[PDB]
Amino acid sequence: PKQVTFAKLNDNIRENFLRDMCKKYGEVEEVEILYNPKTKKHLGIAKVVFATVRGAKDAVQHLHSTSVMGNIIHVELDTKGETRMRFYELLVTGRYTPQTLPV
């Protein structure tokens, strides 16, 4: 369980921002913001894979439900990205918006 899913990220948070915020908790191996692949709209969700279990755990512990860039973000362990997959489906089809995603 080294993979973490972020949700309700402000659309001014891209890879450099999220990498910087996650490196405080441990080495970071992959960071990816998800977009609508046609319109390029930021969907507020992201994948981060940490080098260690401890990095992912500490990042979730200290970032979940914190105020970042003016709203409360959602951060959770997502071992195979299945939770983020459901988030993606709902967001990229416009069933919800990035800030109204049920979490």
**DSSP state letters, 2-63:** -EEEEES--TT--HHHHHHHHHTTS-EEEEEEEE-TTT--EEEEEEEEESSHHHHHHHHHHH
Cβ of 82: how many Cβ atoms within 10 Å?
10
d(CA 27, CA 56): 9
Resolution (angstroms) equals 1.8
DSSP code of residue 92? H
Other CB atoms within a 10 A radius of the CB of residue 8 amount to: 20
Q: Are 46 and 74 in contact, with CB atoms under 8 Å apart?
A: no
From the number of C-beta atoms within 10 Å of its C-beta (0-12, 13-18, 19+), residue 49 rates as: middle
Residue type, 28: V
Solved using: X-ray
**C-beta neighbour count of 31 within 10 angstroms:** 20
Is 84:8 a contact under the CB 8 Å cutoff?
Answer: no
